[PDB]
Amino acid sequence: ADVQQKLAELERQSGGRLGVALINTADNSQILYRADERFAMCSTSKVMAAAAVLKKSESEPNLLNQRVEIKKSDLVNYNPIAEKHVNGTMSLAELSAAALQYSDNVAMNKLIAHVGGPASVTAFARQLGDETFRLDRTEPTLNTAIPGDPRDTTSPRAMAQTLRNLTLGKALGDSQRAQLVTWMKGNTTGAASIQAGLPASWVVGDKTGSGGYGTTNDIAVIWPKDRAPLILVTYFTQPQPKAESRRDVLASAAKIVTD
Ligand SMILES: [Cl-]
Ligand code: NA
């Protein structure tokens, strides 16, 4: 299923293409909708870039304190934190938090560059057992979200399983995992997306993403009250290049799958 029917109805009403994967770690059950189709990740890919740097820091413990220059030449389209630090330096920790909590695109590019570019972030995904994730481009072009274009895409199923590994599993060391979760719980951009469809008492760590074709995404680890955690990925994209974001569709998808 009945949840399936309701998601299909939501997708039809929304006019777009909706991809949902819920992992309920209470019973290892899944709710899936278009969960093997590819969707442009847009800013949700920043979680994988931050995780790759965190993984590197397991071998180089001072890595996160390493300072990175921010130059005018680094600015791109959306740099709310980086623009405050032009001609100075930010640590890799600060850049990670900036990418995850403000969706700063300079921060993302600096994370990508540090680990060796999009192919290296992808190789990190492969090391985790995620053969679906692909990061092809840097910011800002990885957000074009052209229909049929596989660049910078993943599936809901793969992203949900990978997010589970990163936040609830053992992909990262305890310190690094805790840091990732702390950052995602501190996200400032998600209140209108998955969170808006959940009870106020639940704790969410999430990363939103938006891009071309009205692509509106959110990936979340959810701690319900007195329940085992959930992983929820909601990806949404629309047929018109200039379509507006529909965060309400993700909130509605979240409400449907957690009732
Ligand atoms: Cl249009
Ligand atoms: Na993925």
Give me ligand 2 centre to Cα 128, in Å: 10
137, with CB counted inside 10 A (0-12, 13-18, 19+), is middle
Angle, alpha carbons 119-172-176 (nearest 5°): 105
Q: Alpha-carbon distance 30 to 231, whole Å?
A: 9
Which residues make up the environment of ion ligand 1, defined by Cβ < 5 Å?
Answer: 240-242
Q: Can you read off the two tokens belonging to residue 192?
A: 């209108």
Q: What is the largest CA-CA distance in the chain?
A: 56
**Which residue in 103, 41, 36 sits closest to 236, CA to CA?**
41
Q: Alpha-carbon distance 19 to 233, whole Å?
A: 8
Beta bridge partner(s), residue 220? 206, 232
Q: Alpha-carbon distance 9 to 199, whole Å?
A: 22
Domains in the chain: ranges and CATH: 2-258 (3.40.710.10)
Q: Alpha-carbon distance 232 to 35, whole Å?
A: 11
Helix (H, G, I), strand (E, B) or coil at 220: strand
Q: Can you read off the two tokens belonging to residue 49?
A: 């870039």
The enclosing H or E element of 67 equals: strand 67-69
Instruction: Decide if 171 contacts 225 (C-beta within 8 A).
Output: no
Instruction: Decide if 246 contacts 218 (C-beta within 8 A).
Output: no
Angle, alpha carbons 196-19-214 (nearest 5°): 70
**Which residue in 13, 44, 38 sits closest to 249, CA to CA?**
13
Cα distances (Å, whole numbers) of residue 149 to 20, 38, 124, 135, 245:
19, 9, 22, 12, 19
Ligand nearest to the CA of 21: 2
Give me ligand 1 centre to Cα 238, in Å: 10
The enclosing H or E element of 217 equals: strand 215-223
Give me ligand 1 centre to Cα 245, in Å: 12
Q: Can you read off the two tokens belonging to residue 65?
A: 């304190």
Ligand nearest to the CA of 239: 1
Q: CA torsion, points 119, 123, 129, 135, in degrees to nearest 10?
A: -20
Determination technique used:
X-ray
Residue 153 makes CB contacts below 8 A (sequence gap 6+) with 38, 39, 40, 41, 134
Instruction: Decide if 90 contacts 111 (C-beta within 8 A).
Output: no
Kindly write down the DSSP assignment for every residue of 201-214, as one continuous string.
Answer: TSEEEEEEEEETTT
Could you tell me how many residues make up the chain? 259
Angle, alpha carbons 119-120-125 (nearest 5°): 95
Give the amino acid at 253: A
Residue 28 — φ and ψ, nearest 5°?
60, 35
Angle, alpha carbons 240-243-246 (nearest 5°): 130
Kindly list the catalytic residues.
43
Place of tokens 């692909």: 134
Give me ligand 2 centre to Cα 88, in Å: 33
Q: Alpha-carbon distance 229 to 252, whole Å?
A: 19
Give me ligand 2 centre to Cα 103, in Å: 18
Residue 49 makes CB contacts below 8 A (sequence gap 6+) with 99, 108, 111, 112, 115, 121, 135
Ligand nearest to the CA of 44: 2
Residue 74 makes CB contacts below 8 A (sequence gap 6+) with 82, 86, 106, 109, 110
Give me ligand 1 centre to Cα 213, in Å: 8
**Residue 66 half-sphere exposure toward CB, CA atoms < 13 A:** 15
Ligand nearest to the CA of 212: 1
